[PDB]
Amino acid sequence: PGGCHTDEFQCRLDGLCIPLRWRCDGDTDCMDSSDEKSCEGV
Numbered sequence: 001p002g003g004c005h006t007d008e009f010q011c012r013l014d015g016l017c018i019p020l021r022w023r024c025d026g027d028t029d030c031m032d033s034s035d036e037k038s039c040e041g042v
């Protein structure tokens, strides 16, 4: 399963799929944090 839906994100803790537009916002749509535990800035 090399993806979910359009450029969406998959979390290796659990397996869920999240709307990847929300990988750099500071709150966490995945079952952990991996949205943005790697999307720093300034």
Ligand SMILES: [Ca+2]
Residues within 6 Å of the ligand: 022, 023, 024, 025, 026, 027, 028, 029, 030, 035, 036
């Ligand atoms: Ca998020």
